[PDB]
Each structure stands twice: as C-alpha cells, then as structure tokens.
Structure 1
Amino acid sequence: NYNPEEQFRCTIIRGKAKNMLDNLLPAYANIIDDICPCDKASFVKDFNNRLIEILGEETTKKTLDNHRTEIAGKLFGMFYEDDEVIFPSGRTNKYIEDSDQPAFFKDICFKFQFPNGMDKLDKVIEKVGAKIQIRQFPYILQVLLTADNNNIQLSKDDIAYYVLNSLQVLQGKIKPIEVIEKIIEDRSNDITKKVRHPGKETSYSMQHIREQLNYLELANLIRIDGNLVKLNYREAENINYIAQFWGNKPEFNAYKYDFTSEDDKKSFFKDWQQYYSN
C-alpha cells in the first residue's frame, strides 16, 4: 500500500551559514546576547552593522536582513519577539553557557517538524492542506536503524525520494519498515530512484533535503560519507532516544489555527517560535 510515487516537495529554509558556521553561529549568538533586550527598530540596525563586520563590507542590506530573519530568527530559532521587545531565546542562552554546538543542532532536530512556523503563510497553507504532520528527524533516524537491522545502506537519494519527498511518509502514514521493504524490493528489480523536477536544477529538488541531513550531521548523530548516509554509533544513546518519536504526531499542532483569521494567523507564528526557540 505504501506508494513512493506520490511525491511532495516539502522544503526547509535555505541555509546561509554552513561554510563559516564556526564563526557565524558564535557571531549570531554574541550579537543577539549583547544587543538584547531591545525594541525591533534598534534590533534591525544593531544586528546588521555588527554582522556586516563578519560577512564583509560589500554585503547588501537585503542579505543582512535575510540572515537575521531566516537563519538566526527562524531556522536556528535564536531569538523571539514579545510586545515589540526582542529577547535572546532559550537555545541561545544554553549555547552561550556551554558552547555545545552538537547539542545546539541536536535540539533543532528534536523539535523540527512539518508543518512549522518558518514558512510563509502561503506555503504553510499547502502544508496543512496536504494533511502533513511528521517529526522528520526522529523518522530519519528510525529508518536508518531499520536499514542496518536489514543489512542495507541508504544513500542521500534513498532518503530524498523515499522519505523527505514522499507524500505518504510526510503525512505520517507509513512505518519505516514499510519504507525499507520497498527499497529492498526496488533494488532487486534494479531500480534507483531520485528526486528530480523537469525544468528545475538540483538546488530546487535536493538542497533542502541535503541540508536537513546536514543539521542531523551537525547534531553529530549521522555522517555523510560521499553519497552514503550512516549513523554515528558513538552517539547511539541519543539516536535511540530521539528515534522513539518517529510515530509521534508533531508536538506543535498546526491544525488548530484558522488562517482565514488574523488572530490565529498572528498567534501561529508567535506560538511556533515559543515552542521551537524555547
């Protein structure tokens, strides 16, 4: 009954800090911790002017704004806003104190879900319209554990097509054992699947899938060896704990908000930030 042919492009925010993460992530945190608490007006100027010193003088304001709202704001959840006052988030405060970067992204993986409050309301509607609800990273880990238990190795393409771009999987309809069995079957029929969209480049189809795996790698839970995806068994204790929630519905219920309203539409993005950043 599990049919991977039903595909759905479910994206996360495009990354901007993978290359120089060891500088940018401390930069993000230290900038936020220093200038906050403060109103939104002061935050915009103070953040960008301090950040421009790291990214460069030739950096456009739009790029600086994008770093602030997409990465430090939404994807990493390093701050939040309450009554026009921007505070450093709980994840930032912990990172400031222990400097634990794997635990920073381990927390990101444990709480990341579909749908979420990172997307525009436009894309959120399509997420909720397709009855999408999943904790993908617990699911990814459980799939990897099941793969090893069946003596097979998964690639990035296997993860892409059969999990992170599979509609039924993203709806929480499919058990990981069903996915693995389907993969073993396709291989016996000499079938290799890939995520590709006609008239689009690899970035459109794969960048958000690769980068999702990147953060799982930064959490030190897996390793990307060429084209293969392997668990870090030195962190097996954390792998098994997180993997438990593969069949658990998202802890943040995005199916209780009316997006025809503006009361819920405003609280939706506020409540997500509270859940994700704290």
Structure 2
Amino acid sequence: NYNPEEQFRCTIIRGKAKNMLDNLLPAYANIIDDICPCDKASFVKDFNNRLIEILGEETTKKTLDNHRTEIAGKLFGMFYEDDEVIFPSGRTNKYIEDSDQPAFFKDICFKFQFPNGMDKLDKVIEKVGAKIQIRQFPYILQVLLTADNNNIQLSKDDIAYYVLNSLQVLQGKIKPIEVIEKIIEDRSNDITKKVRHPGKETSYSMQHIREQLNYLELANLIRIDGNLVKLNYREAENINYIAQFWGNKPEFNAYKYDFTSEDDKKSFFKDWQQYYSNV
C-alpha cells in the first residue's frame, strides 16, 4: 500500500522571472521572435544584449546566460535548435499571436513531466534510476478534485509531502484517492507532515514545490488561500482537460534512451525540447 514515508526530492529549475513576469515574459518572447532565426553564436550575443536592458546594466553575463538557458530555454520552452539554427518554439509563436499568459502556463502544466530533458544528465539518471514517471500537474489537479469530492481541503505542505516529494506517487504507483484517504487517516491521528531535510534551508526543500504550484496559479487553475490550495472552478473545463491524464504514463518516454551513448544523449535532449516546446 501507499507509503509516503518514502520521500524523494525531485526538482524543477529554479525560477528567475516570477517577480517581473509581466515584463520579462513579453521581453523573452519579443527578443526571441525578433532575432531568430539565427546561428547559435548570434543568438547568445543578441539575446543577452537585449535582456540586459530589462534586468539592468549591472547584471553579470553569467546571470544573462542562465536566464537564456534555464528559463527562456528549458523551463519556459521558448526556443529550440534545429541543425545549427535557433528558432522560436511553438509555445512562443502562439504567445506572440494571442498574448495569453494563462494559456502559456496551462500548456507548460499540460506537458510537464518527470523525468524530463530540462535536468542535468546526472540528475536525469538519478530520476530514471528511481523509476520516476508522472505527469505531475494532471496528478495534482486530480488530487485536488478528489479532496473536494471527499470534503477536505489540502495545504501546500500536504501537496509537498504526500504528492510532489513522495517516491511512490512520483513513480506513478498511487491513486489520488489513496493519497486522500491516507491524509484523512493521518489527520485523525493528529499527524501533520512537512517536507524536511537535515541541515538544509527551506528553499532546498520547498522552492521547486512552491514554484510548481505557482505555475498552476499562473495557469489560472488554482488559487492559494493562506496555506490552502483550492481549485478555480471558473476553469472547471480546463481543470478536467488536464486532470484526466493523472494516471497516464508520461507522453515523453525517458526510458528508451541509453545514456551511455553519445548519440542517444544528444537525441534525449533534442527530443525532449521538441516534445515540450512545440506543436
């Protein structure tokens, strides 16, 4: 049976654009749209030179680079490479046309999965090694729906401990009602569970979990009321479109690549980006 005591830290990339998103997301998209298509060499130079206008002249090159690769590149999936040329992604193209930010993040939540090609290779191998396989946002949404169906409300710490840091859940072995019943069982016994790591600061334990919830909120699919996570039923149709895939294996199969192969390694990251960023 479901045992959440098997805990597993499974990160997503650390954010850089939340505080200024309403400025940075248009800037990312406009920069990429303007300067692409171009060679990788030009991309790096012109992107950084345009972004520094938004972030401030004292921004280091390292920070501009990290914005480019970690956020515009991996996490938000805003460009991709084919041959030796960089192009705007399908997600970027759509946003250029509709300016729809909740749609942008709905698409991110729909496609997000563990394992993925955003992570460093060694981290990929860890997550594959632990047999992780989940579409976490469909899963989170179904957990929230099942909690409502059973007349209980979940906290961020509940989602953190029982879902996004639970090995068995992340392995796709667990039904949302199992999670809900366990939570009810624990609560009756006066047991409240939080994600904890010895000697570590809260950001280590929780930032990637909170930020995953942030992207659901940016997608307009949930609200956060104090420590509580609540569904936005004004978006009930969109909630159900995503939640329905809670029990599906990841659309992108990380497990068909041999990471000891130089060619398979390159394909992994190329195939991931294609799946995640484009139509």
TM class by shorter chain equals over 0.9
Tell me the TM-score normalized by structure 2.
0.99
Consecutive unaligned residues of structure 2, counting only runs of 5 or more, are: none
Name the CA distance, whole Å, in 1 between partners of 2:101 and 2:225.
21
Q: CA deviation at 1:226?
A: 1.7
Per-residue Cα deviation, 1:31-81 (whole angstroms, up to 9, x for no partner)? 000000000000001000100000000100000000000000000000000
Runs of 4+ in 1 over 4 A off after TM superposition: none
Consecutive unaligned residues of structure 1, counting only runs of 5 or more, are: none
Name the CA distance, whole Å, in 2 between partners of 1:179 and 1:118.
28
Per-residue Cα deviation, 1:219-273 (whole angstroms, up to 9, x for no partner)? 0000112211000000001101110000000000000000001010000000000
Per-residue Cα deviation, 1:134-169 (whole angstroms, up to 9, x for no partner)? 000000000000000010000000000000000000
Q: CA deviation at 1:124?
A: 0.1
Name the CA distance, whole Å, in 1 between partners of 2:220 and 2:21.
15
Name the CA distance, whole Å, in 2 between partners of 1:257 and 1:240.
32
Per-residue Cα deviation, 1:102-136 (whole angstroms, up to 9, x for no partner)? 00000000000000000000100001001100000
Name the CA distance, whole Å, in 2 between partners of 1:176 and 1:121.
30
Instruction: Report what 2:275 is aligned to.
Output: 275
Q: How does 1:3-152 map to 2 (within 5 A)?
A: 3-152=3-152
1:71 is paired with a residue whose SS is helix
Tell me the TM-score normalized by structure 1.
1.00
Per-residue Cα deviation, 1:156-205 (whole angstroms, up to 9, x for no partner)? 00000000000000000000000000000000000000001010000000
1:255 is paired with a residue whose SS is helix
2:223 is paired with a residue whose SS is strand
Residue identity over aligned pairs, in percent, reads 100
2:255 is paired with a residue whose SS is coil
1:247 is paired with a residue whose SS is coil
Q: CA deviation at 1:86?
A: 0.1
1:224 is paired with a residue whose SS is strand
Q: Tell me how large the CA RMSD over aligned residues is.
A: 0.4
Name the CA distance, whole Å, in 1 between partners of 2:42 and 2:241.
41
